[PDB]
Design a binder for these strands. Sequence first.
RNA 1: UACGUCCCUCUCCAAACGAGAGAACAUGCAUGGGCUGGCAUGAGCGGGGGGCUCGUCCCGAGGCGCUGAACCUUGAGGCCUCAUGCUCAGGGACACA
Length: 154
Amino acid sequence: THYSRKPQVSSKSAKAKVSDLRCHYKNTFETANVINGMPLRKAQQLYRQVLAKTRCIPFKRYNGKIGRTAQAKEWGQTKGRWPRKSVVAMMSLLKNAEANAIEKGLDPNQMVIKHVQVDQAARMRRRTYRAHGRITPYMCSPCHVQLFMSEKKE
RNA sequence: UACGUCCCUCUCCAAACGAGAGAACAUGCAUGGGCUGGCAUGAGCGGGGGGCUCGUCCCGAGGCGCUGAACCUUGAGGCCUCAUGCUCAGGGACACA
């Protein structure tokens, strides 16, 4: 009940989805929106390069006083980061989507990532202890990621 | 399509981070040598108040000699190509509906 969009040709498109990821929403937002037009192998290349800290993830919406870096001129930004926990959870999802392409009978080297959508999951409640006897919230904010990818060849 | 630009890499006249100046098989980097400076004579070995032993031989801080020795010298980043090592079709992304 979850996919906002459906593929054109569903017999040439493999889906993948995360139930409740427990990464930060505001970092898996930009980790995942950067691969929304990329092929599967160029999107996987980007994530192995964010881990090596050779390329960065551009923070374009939930940036808000992050440090500005020299590597965000690739994306036309000034500030971006290397969110390694949102990166490696998106690598588990690209590996699920290409396993779901092989059992459909499809070549995973021809898959363009159509449709990345990240939405907010239900938050999880903890507690921090402030001065003067106060107790105030310490929420988690996890996320929902979904993607298909449609084959574009010849 | 090309010229190219940017990232990663290297340098520091720049620098909170970006940006900047540069270099990109280049004495470029690494180590060594010499210079230049700093300290103040290294470990080791051998020949003095006194005091043991049976003229001799041992204990003794200090001293003297080899010894302006030894060590340190660019590194947030002194000098000299003075010698040699290391690189082996640099890699990614745009430029490009």
